[PDB]
Design a binder for this molecule. Structure first.
Ligand SMILES: [K+]
Length: 185
């Protein structure tokens, strides 16, 4: 279905001027921030959804990421499919690769401790990552066939929970500046 969810989260640092645009469109102007995640998407994620997006502007300056971001409960797990970024070194436990939507992604797993989640301000949870091996071109219609990622993660025993929460094509960052404009459908 078309989008029905607006995510606008910041830890409070600097400027995160997030604009809830028409329909699935949004934009973000950010500068000297802390952590933040912003985007349009769906209230209930699905492992079978094909996410469409067009990033008309993608201009991160620092640690910023253009990524599908979502959650399950039962158990509580955060997941990320990163298509582009500014300056970022991907590091940590490495599980393999998945090919999807004309690209190849590296699979990582991490843990966050005493951090914000959909369940509270100080929670501990596993994170599943797909990170594109090269930055995806932007400005044209793009697809994330999320089922390919779910299935690849499953093949490494990285199972998602049964109670699906939000699923957003996000702009996220950490102590950085930039601008983005993304339409999601
Ligand atoms: K709006």
């Amino acid at each position: 279905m078309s989008t029905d969810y607006w995510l606008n989260f910041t830890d409070g640092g600097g400027i995160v001027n997030a604009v809830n645009g028409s329909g699935g469109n949004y934009s973000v102007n950010w500068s000297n921030t802390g952590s933040f995640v912003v985007g349009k998407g769906w209230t209930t994620g699905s492992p079978f959804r094909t996410i469409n997006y067009n990033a008309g502007v993608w201009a991160p300056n620092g640690w910023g990421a253009l990524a599908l971001v979502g959650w399950t409960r039962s158990p509580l797990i955060a997941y990320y499919v990163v298509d582009s970024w500014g300056t970022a070194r991907w590091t940590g436990t490495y599980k393999g690769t998945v090919k999807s939507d004309g690209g190849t992604y590296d699979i990582y797993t991490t843990t966050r401790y005493n951090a914000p989640s959909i369940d509270g301000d100080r929670t501990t949870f596993t994170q599943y990552w797909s990170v594109r091996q090269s930055k995806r071109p932007t400005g044209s219609n793009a697809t994330i066939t999320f089922s390919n990622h779910v299935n690849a993660w499953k093949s490494h025993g990285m199972n998602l929970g049964s109670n699906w929460a939000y699923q957003v094509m996000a702009t996220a960052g950490y102590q950085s500046s930039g601008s983005s404009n993304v339409t999601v459908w």
